[PDB]
């Protein structure tokens, strides 16, 4: 179902302007000039010069040639990243300017290292549904409440690959529209945490293999060090 204006204020849409402007990936505001996304997003990206970050966007259609955007100064890919299935599918975007927090643009708290093993029960996946080369982007930002799936249950489904500790699985929902690099956000003790980053896997429905997310809590050290 459809999201409303101001519901997911940490959610951003990342655009490329080369050759033409189009939605490239999802991402989350994690600080004044820090966007957390997936490293696989940048397979075709040469330099940050071609990127635009749009905050406070409900509809892709509302993006015009007068719409305020954040320029990207640096693309930080995790140095151990090779492909999504081998993990380390995480990246930071250092913006050119600082994000001045409003009700339409605010940051999402990273997960607590004390809540490493906590089984979150209020998780959401949001995006414009861009995960494949041929898929058509959703105009309005979509949301779906997704249950977490244990790494053991996840490994059983993906016998061909290795489901590491640095991965978190979500699915077996009672079709999802997360974007590559998009957030898997869980509300714990009435506070939103960025638990996952959409990486690989099939989908969220009961009839699908679960989505494999970058387990944000395992990268808290990496994120703080890079944003220091």
């Amino acid at each position, epitope marked *: 179902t459809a999201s409303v204006r101001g519901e997911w204020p940490w959610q951003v849409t990342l655009h490329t302007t080369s050759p033409t402007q189009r939605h490239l990936c999802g991402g989350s505001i994690i600080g004044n000039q820090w966007i957390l996304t997936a490293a696989h997003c940048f397979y*075709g990206v040469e330099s940050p010069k071609i990127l635009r970050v749009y905050s406070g966007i409900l509809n892709q259609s509302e993006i015009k040639e007068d719409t305020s955007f954040f320029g990207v100064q640096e693309i930080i890919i995790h140095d151990q990243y090779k*492909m999504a299935e081998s993990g380390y599918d995480i990246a930071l975007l250092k913006l050119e300017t600082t994000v001045n927090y409003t009700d339409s643009q605010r940051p999402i708290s990273l997960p607590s290292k004390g809540d490493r093993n906590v089984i979150y029960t209020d998780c959401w996946v949001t995006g414009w549904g*861009y995960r*494949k080369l*041929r898929d058509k982007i959703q105009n309005t930002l979509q949301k779906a409440k997704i249950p977490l799936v244990t790494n053991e249950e996840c490994q059983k489904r993906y016998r061909g690959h290795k489901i590491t500790h640095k991965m978190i699985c979500a699915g077996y929902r009672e079709a999802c529209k997360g974007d590559s690099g998009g957030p898997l956000s869980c509300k714990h003790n009435e506070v939103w945490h960025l638990v996952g980053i959409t*990486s690989w896997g*099939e989908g969220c429905a009961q009839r699908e293999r679960p989505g494999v997310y970058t387990n944000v809590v395992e990268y808290v050290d990496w994120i703080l060090e890079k944003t220091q």
Partner: antibody
Amino acid sequence: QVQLLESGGGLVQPGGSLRLSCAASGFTFSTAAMSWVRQAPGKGLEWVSGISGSGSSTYYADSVKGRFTISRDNSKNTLYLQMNSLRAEDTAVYYCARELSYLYSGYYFDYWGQGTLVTVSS
Amino acid sequence: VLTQPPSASGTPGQRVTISCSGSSSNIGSNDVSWYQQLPGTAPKLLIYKNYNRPSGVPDRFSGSKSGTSASLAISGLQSEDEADYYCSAWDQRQFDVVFGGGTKLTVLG
């Protein structure tokens, strides 16, 4: 292990119709995006159509839009290509293949069938 | 539209490079794959995501990419390697997966 067995290929008159099939084994069919890729005699490869795991989304090359229809039966582990108003330039071996097309993977075909030759001749 | 030389050649135990020319819309900004097609058989995935080998593809095959071009290197050339080799990439501008016309590799000696 993984098998993709094709059948339904043969000779057809110009303007004729044919239903190609591809039976799968050794992987959970419903989880896979499936495609048809053809190869005209002594030529290279050309993607024809693709279909998602559920069957919700279907895609077609420009040369076959409104003539070919792709479908699947997940209970039967089978993929279909209903081809209508066949033309001489549709003469090729048609292979079914499991495709990967995520932004994370790139666009590739990891498992291929053996192919069925489709001949469109008067 | 990916362009490959129609033919390539080498003697046993040599290295042969099969080349693939493209553009900014395909190779220039997309993951490259390579297929081997032995006479009268279906294609087989040799390389995916530029340099990765699927399970069972020997170390002898290596993929690389530099700008709008991609290369398949076949080291320790065997007579069994005599096949058609195809490069492939998604093309954002055409909005379709594209293939090279293939290179027919001949083993001499």
